Design an enzyme around this catalytic site. Structure first.
Site, PDB file in Angstrom:
ATOM      1  N   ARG A  70       0.828  -1.147   0.000  1.00 44.91           N
ATOM      2  CA  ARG A  70       0.000   0.000   0.000  1.00 44.91           C
ATOM      3  C   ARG A  70       0.906   1.255   0.000  1.00 44.91           C
ATOM      4  O   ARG A  70       1.773   1.441   0.870  1.00 44.91           O
ATOM      5  CB  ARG A  70      -0.929  -0.001   1.233  1.00 44.91           C
ATOM      6  CG  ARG A  70      -1.689   1.263   1.373  1.00 44.91           C
ATOM      7  CD  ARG A  70      -2.901   1.169   2.379  1.00 44.91           C
ATOM      8  NE  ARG A  70      -3.556   2.456   2.314  1.00 44.91           N
ATOM      9  CZ  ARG A  70      -3.400   3.434   3.217  1.00 44.91           C
ATOM     10  NH1 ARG A  70      -2.690   3.216   4.306  1.00 44.91           N
ATOM     11  NH2 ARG A  70      -3.931   4.646   3.021  1.00 44.91           N
ATOM     12  N   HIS A 114      -2.703  11.276   0.024  1.00 42.94           N
ATOM     13  CA  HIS A 114      -2.232  11.078   1.391  1.00 42.94           C
ATOM     14  C   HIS A 114      -1.609  12.397   1.850  1.00 42.94           C
ATOM     15  O   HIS A 114      -0.402  12.436   2.219  1.00 42.94           O
ATOM     16  CB  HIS A 114      -1.290   9.899   1.403  1.00 42.94           C
ATOM     17  CG  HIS A 114      -1.229   9.133   2.690  1.00 42.94           C
ATOM     18  ND1 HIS A 114      -0.733   9.661   3.858  1.00 42.94           N
ATOM     19  CD2 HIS A 114      -1.496   7.803   2.957  1.00 42.94           C
ATOM     20  CE1 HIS A 114      -0.758   8.721   4.826  1.00 42.94           C
ATOM     21  NE2 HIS A 114      -1.187   7.580   4.275  1.00 42.94           N
ATOM     22  N   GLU A 159      -7.414   9.038   5.544  1.00 43.49           N
ATOM     23  CA  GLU A 159      -7.758   9.796   6.775  1.00 43.49           C
ATOM     24  C   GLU A 159      -8.148  11.269   6.562  1.00 43.49           C
ATOM     25  O   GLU A 159      -7.420  12.171   6.995  1.00 43.49           O
ATOM     26  CB  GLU A 159      -6.550   9.765   7.717  1.00 43.49           C
ATOM     27  CG  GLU A 159      -6.037   8.356   7.923  1.00 43.49           C
ATOM     28  CD  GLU A 159      -5.190   8.240   9.160  1.00 43.49           C
ATOM     29  OE1 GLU A 159      -4.587   9.250   9.586  1.00 43.49           O
ATOM     30  OE2 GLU A 159      -5.136   7.131   9.725  1.00 43.49           O
ATOM     31  N   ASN A 277      -8.004   2.208   9.167  1.00 40.94           N
ATOM     32  CA  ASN A 277      -6.746   2.531   9.874  1.00 40.94           C
ATOM     33  C   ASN A 277      -7.059   2.518  11.340  1.00 40.94           C
ATOM     34  O   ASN A 277      -7.948   3.231  11.794  1.00 40.94           O
ATOM     35  CB  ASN A 277      -6.159   3.883   9.469  1.00 40.94           C
ATOM     36  CG  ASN A 277      -5.491   3.869   8.097  1.00 40.94           C
ATOM     37  OD1 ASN A 277      -5.398   2.824   7.435  1.00 40.94           O
ATOM     38  ND2 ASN A 277      -5.045   5.049   7.632  1.00 40.94           N
ATOM     39  N   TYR A 279      -4.988   2.421  15.364  1.00 44.44           N
ATOM     40  CA  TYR A 279      -3.775   2.352  16.231  1.00 44.44           C
ATOM     41  C   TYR A 279      -4.127   2.235  17.690  1.00 44.44           C
ATOM     42  O   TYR A 279      -3.466   1.526  18.412  1.00 44.44           O
ATOM     43  CB  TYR A 279      -2.900   3.613  16.072  1.00 44.44           C
ATOM     44  CG  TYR A 279      -2.327   3.757  14.677  1.00 44.44           C
ATOM     45  CD1 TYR A 279      -3.045   4.403  13.680  1.00 44.44           C
ATOM     46  CD2 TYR A 279      -1.059   3.207  14.352  1.00 44.44           C
ATOM     47  CE1 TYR A 279      -2.560   4.526  12.422  1.00 44.44           C
ATOM     48  CE2 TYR A 279      -0.549   3.309  13.055  1.00 44.44           C
ATOM     49  CZ  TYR A 279      -1.303   3.971  12.107  1.00 44.44           C
ATOM     50  OH  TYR A 279      -0.815   4.110  10.871  1.00 44.44           O
ATOM     51  N   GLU A 333      -3.936   0.308   7.793  1.00 43.13           N
ATOM     52  CA  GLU A 333      -2.806   0.670   8.653  1.00 43.13           C
ATOM     53  C   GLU A 333      -3.004   0.115  10.055  1.00 43.13           C
ATOM     54  O   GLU A 333      -4.110   0.261  10.650  1.00 43.13           O
ATOM     55  CB  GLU A 333      -2.566   2.172   8.753  1.00 43.13           C
ATOM     56  CG  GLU A 333      -2.143   2.864   7.427  1.00 43.13           C
ATOM     57  CD  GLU A 333      -1.995   4.410   7.591  1.00 43.13           C
ATOM     58  OE1 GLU A 333      -1.815   4.903   8.753  1.00 43.13           O
ATOM     59  OE2 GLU A 333      -2.100   5.121   6.567  1.00 43.13           O
TER      60      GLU A 333
HETATM   61 CL   LIG Z   1     -10.785   9.697   8.608  1.00 42.55          CL
END
Ligand SMILES: [Cl-]
Length: 424
Positions: A70, A114, A159, A277, A279, A333
Protein backbone atom coordinates in the site's frame (compact mmCIF):
# COMPACT_ATOMS: atom_id res chain seq x y z
CA UNK A 1 -9.28 -15.55 -2.61
CA UNK A 2 -5.84 -14.70 -1.15
CA UNK A 3 -6.11 -12.60 2.05
CA UNK A 4 -3.74 -9.62 1.52
CA UNK A 5 -0.70 -9.55 3.85
CA UNK A 6 0.75 -6.06 3.30
CA UNK A 7 2.81 -3.17 4.49
CA UNK A 8 1.93 0.51 3.95
CA UNK A 9 3.77 3.83 3.34
CA UNK A 10 2.93 7.29 1.85
CA UNK A 11 4.75 9.35 -0.75
CA UNK A 12 5.79 12.43 1.22
CA UNK A 13 6.87 10.29 4.19
CA UNK A 14 9.42 8.22 2.17
CA UNK A 15 10.22 9.57 -1.26
CA UNK A 16 12.60 12.51 -0.91
CA UNK A 17 13.37 13.97 -4.33
CA UNK A 18 11.16 16.90 -3.23
CA UNK A 19 12.51 19.20 -5.95
CA UNK A 20 13.49 16.67 -8.57
CA UNK A 21 12.01 15.70 -11.91
CA UNK A 22 9.58 18.57 -12.04
CA UNK A 23 7.85 17.90 -8.65
CA UNK A 24 5.79 20.92 -7.53
CA UNK A 25 5.84 21.83 -3.83
CA UNK A 26 3.11 20.52 -1.58
CA UNK A 27 1.38 22.05 1.53
CA UNK A 28 3.74 19.82 3.67
CA UNK A 29 6.87 21.35 2.02
CA UNK A 30 5.70 24.81 3.04
CA UNK A 31 4.40 23.72 6.50
CA UNK A 32 7.78 22.10 7.29
CA UNK A 33 9.43 25.47 6.62
CA UNK A 34 7.50 27.02 9.52
CA UNK A 35 9.49 27.33 12.77
CA UNK A 36 8.20 24.81 15.30
CA UNK A 37 5.73 22.93 13.05
CA UNK A 38 8.06 19.87 13.05
CA UNK A 39 9.48 18.93 16.50
CA UNK A 40 12.99 18.14 15.29
CA UNK A 41 13.05 20.96 12.69
CA UNK A 42 13.11 18.36 9.89
CA UNK A 43 11.43 18.20 6.47
CA UNK A 44 10.32 15.71 3.83
CA UNK A 45 13.90 15.86 2.55
CA UNK A 46 15.15 13.41 2.16
CA UNK A 47 12.85 10.97 3.97
CA UNK A 48 13.97 7.45 3.00
CA UNK A 49 15.23 8.40 -0.47
CA UNK A 50 12.65 5.93 -1.78
CA UNK A 51 12.33 7.67 -5.14
CA UNK A 52 15.89 6.43 -6.06
CA UNK A 53 15.90 3.31 -3.87
CA UNK A 54 12.52 1.72 -4.76
CA UNK A 55 14.08 -1.49 -6.24
CA UNK A 56 15.89 -2.21 -3.01
CA UNK A 57 12.67 -1.45 -1.06
CA UNK A 58 10.58 -3.85 -3.13
CA UNK A 59 13.28 -6.52 -2.55
CA UNK A 60 12.79 -5.90 1.19
CA UNK A 61 9.08 -6.55 0.75
CA UNK A 62 9.83 -9.76 -1.11
CA UNK A 63 12.06 -10.94 1.59
CA UNK A 64 9.20 -10.76 4.09
CA UNK A 65 6.86 -12.61 1.78
CA UNK A 66 4.48 -9.65 1.88
CA UNK A 67 1.83 -10.03 -0.87
CA UNK A 68 0.56 -6.45 -1.20
CA UNK A 69 2.07 -2.97 -1.01
CA UNK A 70 0.00 0.00 0.00
CA UNK A 71 1.50 3.32 -1.16
CA UNK A 72 0.40 6.80 -2.20
CA UNK A 73 0.89 8.74 -5.39
CA UNK A 74 2.30 12.29 -4.97
CA UNK A 75 -0.23 14.63 -6.64
CA UNK A 76 2.42 17.41 -6.89
CA UNK A 77 4.60 14.98 -8.98
CA UNK A 78 1.70 14.42 -11.40
CA UNK A 79 0.40 17.95 -11.76
CA UNK A 80 2.94 20.38 -10.21
CA UNK A 81 0.40 23.16 -10.11
CA UNK A 82 -2.40 20.87 -9.00
CA UNK A 83 -4.45 21.20 -12.17
CA UNK A 84 -3.92 21.53 -15.94
CA UNK A 85 -0.39 20.63 -16.89
CA UNK A 86 0.72 16.99 -16.48
CA UNK A 87 4.32 16.08 -15.69
CA UNK A 88 5.20 12.84 -17.49
CA UNK A 89 8.23 12.12 -15.31
CA UNK A 90 5.71 11.75 -12.47
CA UNK A 91 3.52 9.12 -14.00
CA UNK A 92 6.72 7.47 -15.40
CA UNK A 93 7.99 6.89 -11.86
CA UNK A 94 4.73 5.29 -10.56
CA UNK A 95 4.36 3.35 -13.81
CA UNK A 96 7.79 1.79 -13.24
CA UNK A 97 7.08 1.19 -9.55
CA UNK A 98 3.89 -0.70 -10.48
CA UNK A 99 5.73 -2.88 -13.08
CA UNK A 100 8.33 -3.83 -10.43
CA UNK A 101 5.70 -4.77 -7.84
CA UNK A 102 3.98 -6.98 -10.36
CA UNK A 103 7.25 -8.63 -11.42
CA UNK A 104 7.91 -9.30 -7.65
CA UNK A 105 4.49 -10.93 -6.91
CA UNK A 106 3.09 -7.91 -5.06
CA UNK A 107 -0.49 -6.55 -5.39
CA UNK A 108 -0.38 -2.71 -5.73
CA UNK A 109 -2.81 -0.97 -3.29
CA UNK A 110 -2.87 2.68 -4.23
CA UNK A 111 -3.81 5.75 -2.19
CA UNK A 112 -4.46 8.86 -4.35
CA UNK A 113 -4.41 11.50 -1.64
CA UNK A 114 -2.23 11.08 1.39
CA UNK A 115 -2.11 14.78 2.55
CA UNK A 116 0.34 16.27 0.05
CA UNK A 117 -2.02 18.84 -1.54
CA UNK A 118 -0.17 20.89 -4.21
CA UNK A 119 0.73 24.30 -2.77
CA UNK A 120 -0.64 26.02 -5.91
CA UNK A 121 -4.13 24.79 -5.00
CA UNK A 122 -3.78 25.83 -1.34
CA UNK A 123 -3.00 29.34 -2.37
CA UNK A 124 -6.40 29.40 -4.15
CA UNK A 125 -8.04 28.20 -0.89
CA UNK A 126 -7.12 24.43 -0.99
CA UNK A 127 -9.76 22.12 0.52
CA UNK A 128 -11.76 25.20 1.59
CA UNK A 129 -12.40 25.84 -2.10
CA UNK A 130 -14.97 23.75 -3.97
CA UNK A 131 -12.74 23.82 -7.08
CA UNK A 132 -10.13 21.68 -5.31
CA UNK A 133 -12.65 18.73 -5.30
CA UNK A 134 -12.89 19.00 -9.15
CA UNK A 135 -9.10 19.35 -9.35
CA UNK A 136 -8.87 16.11 -7.22
CA UNK A 137 -11.16 14.20 -9.62
CA UNK A 138 -9.14 15.29 -12.67
CA UNK A 139 -5.99 14.15 -10.90
CA UNK A 140 -7.63 10.79 -10.07
CA UNK A 141 -8.61 10.37 -13.65
CA UNK A 142 -5.10 10.93 -15.04
CA UNK A 143 -3.75 8.36 -12.55
CA UNK A 144 -6.26 5.59 -13.37
CA UNK A 145 -5.82 6.27 -17.09
CA UNK A 146 -2.11 5.43 -16.67
CA UNK A 147 -2.23 2.81 -13.96
CA UNK A 148 -5.61 0.96 -13.69
CA UNK A 149 -4.56 -1.75 -16.15
CA UNK A 150 -2.24 -3.06 -13.41
CA UNK A 151 -3.37 -1.55 -10.10
CA UNK A 152 -6.56 -3.35 -8.94
CA UNK A 153 -7.16 -1.16 -5.82
CA UNK A 154 -7.54 2.61 -5.60
CA UNK A 155 -8.45 4.52 -2.47
CA UNK A 156 -9.39 8.15 -2.99
CA UNK A 157 -8.31 9.61 0.39
CA UNK A 158 -6.32 8.61 3.41
CA UNK A 159 -7.76 9.80 6.77
CA UNK A 160 -9.70 12.88 5.72
CA UNK A 161 -10.44 13.49 9.39
CA UNK A 162 -6.74 14.37 9.88
CA UNK A 163 -6.75 16.56 6.76
CA UNK A 164 -9.90 18.45 7.84
CA UNK A 165 -9.50 18.82 11.54
CA UNK A 166 -5.78 18.51 12.24
CA UNK A 167 -5.13 20.48 9.07
CA UNK A 168 -7.64 23.29 9.57
CA UNK A 169 -8.82 23.41 13.16
CA UNK A 170 -6.01 22.32 15.60
CA UNK A 171 -3.41 23.59 13.04
CA UNK A 172 -1.14 20.63 13.91
CA UNK A 173 -0.98 19.45 10.26
CA UNK A 174 -0.52 21.29 6.97
CA UNK A 175 -1.48 23.68 5.92
CA UNK A 176 -1.91 24.81 9.53
CA UNK A 177 -5.22 26.61 9.98
CA UNK A 178 -7.13 27.14 13.18
CA UNK A 179 -10.73 27.81 12.23
CA UNK A 180 -13.61 25.41 12.64
CA UNK A 181 -15.44 26.73 9.57
CA UNK A 182 -12.35 26.22 7.35
CA UNK A 183 -12.26 22.65 8.80
CA UNK A 184 -15.92 21.89 7.97
CA UNK A 185 -15.51 23.40 4.49
CA UNK A 186 -12.46 21.10 4.06
CA UNK A 187 -14.39 18.04 5.40
CA UNK A 188 -17.12 18.64 2.94
CA UNK A 189 -14.80 19.20 -0.07
CA UNK A 190 -12.66 16.20 0.76
CA UNK A 191 -15.92 14.13 0.71
CA UNK A 192 -17.13 15.86 -2.51
CA UNK A 193 -13.71 15.16 -4.11
CA UNK A 194 -14.04 11.53 -2.98
CA UNK A 195 -17.41 11.12 -4.79
CA UNK A 196 -16.29 12.94 -7.94
CA UNK A 197 -13.04 10.82 -7.95
CA UNK A 198 -15.08 7.62 -7.71
CA UNK A 199 -16.92 8.48 -10.92
CA UNK A 200 -13.63 9.45 -12.71
CA UNK A 201 -11.91 6.29 -11.49
CA UNK A 202 -14.60 3.95 -12.68
CA UNK A 203 -14.95 5.79 -16.00
CA UNK A 204 -11.24 5.27 -16.45
CA UNK A 205 -11.37 1.55 -15.60
CA UNK A 206 -10.40 1.26 -11.90
CA UNK A 207 -11.59 -2.16 -10.72
CA UNK A 208 -11.87 -1.66 -6.94
CA UNK A 209 -12.47 1.78 -5.46
CA UNK A 210 -12.73 2.75 -1.85
CA UNK A 211 -11.54 5.06 0.83
CA UNK A 212 -9.30 4.76 3.93
CA UNK A 213 -10.60 6.17 7.24
CA UNK A 214 -9.08 6.58 10.69
CA UNK A 215 -10.99 5.00 13.63
CA UNK A 216 -10.28 5.86 17.26
CA UNK A 217 -12.96 4.02 19.25
CA UNK A 218 -14.03 5.99 22.30
CA UNK A 219 -14.50 4.53 25.89
CA UNK A 220 -15.51 6.00 29.20
CA UNK A 221 -17.93 6.05 32.17
CA UNK A 222 -20.31 8.62 30.57
CA UNK A 223 -22.15 7.34 27.39
CA UNK A 224 -22.96 10.81 26.19
CA UNK A 225 -19.30 11.95 26.01
CA UNK A 226 -18.43 8.62 24.33
CA UNK A 227 -21.07 9.33 21.69
CA UNK A 228 -19.80 12.88 21.08
CA UNK A 229 -16.23 11.52 20.56
CA UNK A 230 -17.49 8.73 18.29
CA UNK A 231 -19.49 11.18 16.14
CA UNK A 232 -16.56 13.55 15.72
CA UNK A 233 -13.85 10.93 14.99
CA UNK A 234 -15.59 7.79 13.82
CA UNK A 235 -18.75 8.75 11.97
CA UNK A 236 -18.13 12.20 10.48
CA UNK A 237 -16.78 10.79 7.20
CA UNK A 238 -18.14 7.24 7.38
CA UNK A 239 -21.82 8.15 7.74
CA UNK A 240 -21.80 10.36 4.62
CA UNK A 241 -19.92 7.69 2.65
CA UNK A 242 -22.66 5.17 3.84
CA UNK A 243 -25.38 7.48 2.55
CA UNK A 244 -26.71 8.39 6.10
CA UNK A 245 -25.77 12.00 5.81
CA UNK A 246 -23.54 13.65 8.38
CA UNK A 247 -24.05 12.50 11.95
CA UNK A 248 -25.79 14.86 14.44
CA UNK A 249 -23.10 17.55 15.03
CA UNK A 250 -20.62 16.90 17.86
CA UNK A 251 -19.96 20.65 18.00
CA UNK A 252 -21.84 23.30 20.06
CA UNK A 253 -22.84 26.10 17.67
CA UNK A 254 -21.26 24.83 14.46
CA UNK A 255 -20.85 27.17 11.42
CA UNK A 256 -22.53 26.13 8.11
CA UNK A 257 -21.17 23.34 5.81
CA UNK A 258 -21.25 24.43 2.11
CA UNK A 259 -23.42 21.36 1.20
CA UNK A 260 -24.80 22.12 -2.24
CA UNK A 261 -27.79 20.42 -3.78
CA UNK A 262 -27.00 16.82 -4.86
CA UNK A 263 -23.58 16.81 -2.94
CA UNK A 264 -24.66 14.07 -0.54
CA UNK A 265 -25.82 11.81 -3.40
CA UNK A 266 -22.36 12.30 -5.02
CA UNK A 267 -20.59 11.53 -1.73
CA UNK A 268 -22.55 8.20 -1.20
CA UNK A 269 -21.26 6.50 -4.32
CA UNK A 270 -21.08 2.66 -4.22
CA UNK A 271 -17.55 1.47 -3.25
CA UNK A 272 -15.71 -1.87 -3.40
CA UNK A 273 -14.05 -1.71 0.01
CA UNK A 274 -13.42 0.30 3.13
CA UNK A 275 -9.87 0.70 4.42
CA UNK A 276 -9.73 0.67 8.25
CA UNK A 277 -6.75 2.53 9.87
CA UNK A 278 -6.47 1.66 13.54
CA UNK A 279 -3.77 2.35 16.23
CA UNK A 280 -5.52 3.04 19.56
CA UNK A 281 -8.82 3.75 21.30
CA UNK A 282 -9.39 7.04 23.24
CA UNK A 283 -10.72 7.35 26.76
CA UNK A 284 -13.06 10.29 27.22
CA UNK A 285 -14.92 12.24 29.87
CA UNK A 286 -17.51 15.02 29.71
CA UNK A 287 -15.78 18.31 28.79
CA UNK A 288 -17.00 21.81 28.09
CA UNK A 289 -16.50 23.94 25.00
CA UNK A 290 -17.02 23.78 21.21
CA UNK A 291 -16.22 20.13 21.44
CA UNK A 292 -17.65 19.12 24.86
CA UNK A 293 -15.27 16.24 25.54
CA UNK A 294 -12.12 15.78 27.60
CA UNK A 295 -9.48 13.30 26.50
CA UNK A 296 -8.03 11.21 29.31
CA UNK A 297 -4.59 9.49 29.90
CA UNK A 298 -3.81 5.98 28.53
CA UNK A 299 -4.94 3.18 30.96
CA UNK A 300 -1.85 0.96 31.13
CA UNK A 301 0.78 0.22 28.40
CA UNK A 302 1.24 2.90 25.70
CA UNK A 303 3.51 3.42 22.73
CA UNK A 304 6.07 6.24 22.30
CA UNK A 305 3.13 8.25 20.85
CA UNK A 306 1.43 7.96 24.24
CA UNK A 307 -1.28 5.82 22.51
CA UNK A 308 -2.83 3.04 24.54
CA UNK A 309 -2.08 -0.52 23.42
CA UNK A 310 -5.50 -2.17 23.22
CA UNK A 311 -5.68 -5.05 20.71
CA UNK A 312 -9.27 -5.97 21.72
CA UNK A 313 -10.23 -2.55 20.35
CA UNK A 314 -9.41 -3.68 16.84
CA UNK A 315 -11.54 -6.77 17.22
CA UNK A 316 -14.52 -4.88 18.55
CA UNK A 317 -14.10 -2.22 15.89
CA UNK A 318 -14.10 -4.82 13.11
CA UNK A 319 -17.19 -6.56 14.50
CA UNK A 320 -19.10 -3.22 14.68
CA UNK A 321 -18.00 -2.20 11.17
CA UNK A 322 -18.73 -5.72 9.88
CA UNK A 323 -22.40 -5.11 10.73
CA UNK A 324 -22.61 -1.60 9.33
CA UNK A 325 -20.42 -1.55 6.20
CA UNK A 326 -21.84 -3.40 3.16
CA UNK A 327 -18.37 -3.83 1.60
CA UNK A 328 -15.30 -5.89 2.54
CA UNK A 329 -12.85 -4.37 5.14
CA UNK A 330 -9.08 -4.07 4.80
CA UNK A 331 -7.02 -2.98 7.77
CA UNK A 332 -4.99 -0.55 5.74
CA UNK A 333 -2.81 0.67 8.65
CA UNK A 334 -1.81 -0.85 11.97
CA UNK A 335 1.54 -0.44 13.79
CA UNK A 336 3.42 1.22 16.69
CA UNK A 337 6.13 3.71 17.46
CA UNK A 338 8.71 2.63 20.07
CA UNK A 339 12.16 4.16 20.61
CA UNK A 340 14.35 1.74 18.54
CA UNK A 341 18.09 2.02 18.95
CA UNK A 342 20.73 0.62 16.68
CA UNK A 343 24.45 0.38 17.46
CA UNK A 344 25.89 -1.87 14.78
CA UNK A 345 24.07 -5.21 15.13
CA UNK A 346 22.45 -7.09 12.25
CA UNK A 347 18.97 -6.80 13.81
CA UNK A 348 17.20 -4.16 15.86
CA UNK A 349 15.54 -5.57 19.02
CA UNK A 350 11.93 -4.37 19.14
CA UNK A 351 10.06 -6.83 21.47
CA UNK A 352 7.28 -4.27 22.17
CA UNK A 353 6.50 -3.86 18.48
CA UNK A 354 6.53 -7.64 18.10
CA UNK A 355 4.07 -7.86 21.07
CA UNK A 356 1.91 -5.05 19.61
CA UNK A 357 1.68 -6.54 16.07
CA UNK A 358 1.09 -10.18 17.17
CA UNK A 359 -1.81 -9.19 19.46
CA UNK A 360 -3.42 -6.95 16.77
CA UNK A 361 -3.05 -9.61 14.08
CA UNK A 362 -4.74 -12.16 16.43
CA UNK A 363 -7.58 -9.61 16.98
CA UNK A 364 -8.17 -8.92 13.28
CA UNK A 365 -8.05 -12.63 12.37
CA UNK A 366 -10.46 -13.30 15.18
CA UNK A 367 -12.98 -10.81 13.71
CA UNK A 368 -12.60 -12.54 10.36
CA UNK A 369 -13.10 -16.00 11.96
CA UNK A 370 -16.32 -14.61 13.41
CA UNK A 371 -17.59 -13.74 9.95
CA UNK A 372 -16.34 -10.18 9.28
CA UNK A 373 -15.53 -9.90 5.56
CA UNK A 374 -11.91 -8.86 6.30
CA UNK A 375 -9.65 -9.43 3.22
CA UNK A 376 -6.25 -7.91 4.14
CA UNK A 377 -4.02 -6.52 6.91
CA UNK A 378 -1.21 -3.94 6.34
CA UNK A 379 1.49 -2.97 8.86
CA UNK A 380 2.37 0.70 9.12
CA UNK A 381 5.07 0.80 8.08
CA UNK A 382 7.67 -0.97 5.84
CA UNK A 383 10.44 1.19 7.27
CA UNK A 384 11.09 4.20 9.59
CA UNK A 385 10.14 7.38 7.79
CA UNK A 386 9.13 11.05 8.16
CA UNK A 387 6.34 10.97 10.77
CA UNK A 388 4.67 14.30 10.05
CA UNK A 389 4.80 16.77 13.02
CA UNK A 390 7.17 14.26 14.75
CA UNK A 391 9.77 14.41 11.95
CA UNK A 392 12.17 11.58 12.37
CA UNK A 393 11.63 11.01 16.06
CA UNK A 394 8.99 8.29 16.04
CA UNK A 395 10.09 5.07 14.39
CA UNK A 396 7.26 2.77 13.11
CA UNK A 397 9.06 0.57 10.62
CA UNK A 398 9.54 -3.21 10.38
CA UNK A 399 12.96 -2.12 9.10
CA UNK A 400 15.10 0.40 11.02
CA UNK A 401 16.41 3.19 8.74
CA UNK A 402 19.75 4.74 9.61
CA UNK A 403 18.94 8.04 7.90
CA UNK A 404 22.51 9.34 7.35
CA UNK A 405 23.54 6.35 5.17
CA UNK A 406 19.95 5.23 4.19
CA UNK A 407 20.87 1.69 5.27
CA UNK A 408 17.83 -0.49 6.08
CA UNK A 409 18.28 -2.89 9.02
CA UNK A 410 15.57 -5.46 9.81
CA UNK A 411 14.00 -5.34 13.27
CA UNK A 412 12.75 -8.36 15.22
CA UNK A 413 9.28 -7.41 14.03
CA UNK A 414 10.27 -7.92 10.31
CA UNK A 415 11.38 -11.49 11.13
CA UNK A 416 8.21 -12.03 13.21
CA UNK A 417 5.96 -10.88 10.32
CA UNK A 418 7.75 -12.95 7.68
CA UNK A 419 7.19 -16.11 9.80
CA UNK A 420 3.65 -14.91 10.57
CA UNK A 421 2.74 -14.68 6.89
CA UNK A 422 4.34 -18.04 6.22
CA UNK A 423 2.38 -19.93 8.87
CA UNK A 424 -0.65 -18.62 6.99
CL1 LIG B 1 -10.78 9.70 8.61
Amino acid sequence: EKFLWGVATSAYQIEGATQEDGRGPSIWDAFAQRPGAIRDGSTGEPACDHYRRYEEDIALMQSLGVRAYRFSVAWPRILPEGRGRINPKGLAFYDRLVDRLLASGITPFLTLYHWDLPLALEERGGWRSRETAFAFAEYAEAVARALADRVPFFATLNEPWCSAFLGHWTGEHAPGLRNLEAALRAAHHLLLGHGLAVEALRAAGARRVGIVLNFAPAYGEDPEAVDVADRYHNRFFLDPILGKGYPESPFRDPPPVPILSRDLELVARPLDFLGVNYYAPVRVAPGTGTLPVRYLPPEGPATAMGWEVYPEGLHHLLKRLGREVPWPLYVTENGAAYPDLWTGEAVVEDPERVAYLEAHVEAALRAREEGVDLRGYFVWSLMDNFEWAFGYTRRSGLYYVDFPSQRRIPKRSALWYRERIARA
